[PDB]
Every structure is written in C-alpha cells, then in structure tokens.
C-alpha cells in the first residue's frame, strides 16, 4: 500500500477448471485434464461424494457412455478455427489442431 494505491482493489481471476476422468473405449482412464464434454462433466459431478450426488460408478455402463461421447464430439464444419482469436481463453489448447465439436461447455 502506497500513495499510488490507496486501497486494495477487488480481486477476481480466470482459471482452467477441475480435472475429470475421461474414459476411453480401450479401457484407459486418462483422468489428466479438464474436458469440455458434457458427459464427462456430468459423470464427475454425479460420482463426486464430497459434493454432488454421491453415486457409485459401478451403476454406470461405460461402454454406453463412451458411445455417447463419440456422438457429442462429432466435428462441425460450419466455421473454421481461424475466425476465433480468443481460442486459448475459449478453452482450446491449440488453435491449429481441430478444436471444433458440436458442443463445447465452460
């Protein structure tokens, strides 16, 4: 604190969110990063027990859910990535690798 900053400002931040257990049809569980996919978002929120619904994972059919994600990650072509400069803040980790899917959620 000094004559040029006579008070503390408000503080808010931009962050990249919780890591989620994305599955793969081969039986891996990458669990490494955020995912923009709404299914894996829902699954984490439901199976969390510290918060959320406290549902045990054994009640879900993984071989079904992975097909649903394979639907929801279909590529769109109504636009092209170069029209989106923000992309890093939009959530894409690389502007060149396809970042386009029917649905992306933040």
């Amino acid at each position: 604190i000094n004559e040029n900053r006579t008070e503390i400002p408000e503080v808010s931040a931009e962050i990249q969110g919780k890591k989620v257990k994305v599955y793969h049809s081969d039986g891996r569980v990458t669990a490494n990063s955020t995912s923009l996919n709404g299914i894996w978002q829902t699954l984490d929120y439901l199976t969390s027990d510290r918060y959320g619904a406290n549902i045990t994972i054994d009640q879900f059919p993984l071989q079904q859910l992975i097909q649903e994600a394979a639907i929801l990650d279909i590529i769109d072509e109504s636009y092209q990535v170069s029209w989106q400069p923000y992309w890093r803040y939009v959530g894409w980790t690389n502007p060149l690798a396809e970042n386009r899917q029917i649905v992306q959620m933040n």
Binding site: I1, V11, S12, A13, I15, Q16, G17, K18, G91
Partner: protein
C-alpha cells in the same frame, strides 16, 4: 472480512460480485423477470450463500472468497490476504483481474 473492510472504499466495504450470472433461461420464466433477476452483485452481510465454493469445468472467470487478512507487524503497509477460489484440483490459474483491470493486455 470485518478486518478487510478497513482497507476499502465505502463503495465496496462488504460487497461481492455474484457467481453464475446467467442461469439457464426456460419457458418457465418471463423474459422480463429473468433479465431483472440476473444480478451482478451481492452483499455478504446477511448473505451466507455467497460463501459456498463453486465448481468449474472448462474456462471461467470467478471472484475470490477472502478467508484471511492481516498486516506485517512492523510495516502496516504490507498486507497479506488469502482468497479461496475453486473446488478440487484445477488445471490452473490463467490470469488475475484487479478491479476490472487484467494484468495481460487485451
């Protein structure tokens, strides 16, 4: 918080920014009542819901919940503050805004 107020202009001394400003609209709402209930700010005085931790997936901007404030004994100009932000292991912080001013140039 009652300590932190002694370092803020009367504009702010107990105010806080809201979270998830645009909750989902549906035909259940009147257009007016929706946009009139969309609200930017809250007062923590007489409000407890503000202090619930949010969960984030993808990229978002969120306000910090203060949980500790103090000054170095010899030099009251030096102020430490702790802001809690988000549940779980996040992929990480990207940026900070002090007031609305971001560190990185727009």
């Amino acid at each position: 918080i009652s300590i932190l107020a002694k370092y803020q202009v009367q504009e702010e001394r107990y105010k806080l920014k809201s979270k998830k400003k645009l909750f989902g609209l549906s035909r259940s709402y009147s257009l007016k009542k929706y946009y009139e209930t969309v609200t930017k700010e809250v007062d923590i005085d007489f409000n407890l819901a503000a202090k619930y931790i949010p969960v984030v997936y993808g990229v978002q901007k969120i306000p910090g919940i203060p949980i500790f404030a103090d000054t170095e004994l010899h030099n009251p100009n030096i102020v430490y503050v702790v802001y809690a932000f988000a549940e779980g292991e996040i992929d990480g912080f990207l940026d900070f805004s002090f007031g609305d001013n971001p560190m990185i140039c727009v």
